[PDB]
Design a protein around this ligand. Structure first.
Ligand SMILES: [Au+]
Length: 188
């Protein structure tokens, strides 16, 4: 349904791909929803997911909020992808640019998301731009950290079931930034 703009195949077999589309429409096993400690769903990603999933999507998040309690910084939690093409929604609470250890916390956020996907043996995960924008990270800084974390995760987790990682972006600058950063991984 969509078109891949750039592909980076890591040495361990994972395919990282940049795509420009509605992240809520992507048929990936998991979709990442950047949120806050209270599972707020008004973000741009949250909005498109609620648009797609409607009541079902929202109920699932409301139930998760109840069971999980406040989502700590860099924490991630999963709700069933009811009402969405994605099988699961992985909610994450990224640190805010400027926090004491915001950079290492952004990397941790990403790793926590990937870990939750592997816990369910998922084969694909779609990430929107995290950290930058809402949470204040410069776009390039966020991109570098996220890719560094993903790269690090795969060379540290041998049993990983994740075969495809999508970066779903909307603006040209973000696309340009991600393709540049992605090209730096396993390029020897
Ligand atoms: Au920082």
């Amino acid at each position: 349904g969509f078109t891949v703009l750039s592909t980076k195949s890591l040495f361990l077999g994972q395919k990282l791909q940049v795509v420009q589309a509605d992240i809520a429409s992507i048929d990936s096993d998991a979709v990442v929803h950047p949120t806050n400690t209270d599972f707020y769903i008004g973000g741009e990603v949250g909005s498109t997911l609620e648009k797609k999933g409607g009541k079902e999507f929202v109920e699932a998040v409301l139930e998760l909020r109840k069971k999980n309690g406040p989502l700590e910084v860099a924490g991630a939690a999963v709700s069933a992808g009811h009402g969405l093409p994605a099988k699961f929604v992985i909610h994450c609470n990224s640190p805010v640019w400027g926090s004491d250890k915001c950079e290492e916390l952004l990397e941790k956020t990403v790793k926590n998301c990937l870990a939750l996907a592997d816990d369910r043996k998922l084969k694909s995960i779609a990430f929107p731009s995290i950290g930058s924008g809402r949470n204040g990270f410069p776009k390039q800084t966020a991109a570098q950290l996220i890719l560094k974390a993903i790269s690090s995760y795969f060379v540290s987790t041998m049993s990983s079931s994740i075969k495809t990682v999508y970066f779903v972006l909307f603006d040209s600058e973000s696309i340009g930034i991600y393709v540049q950063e992605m090209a730096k991984l396993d390029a020897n």
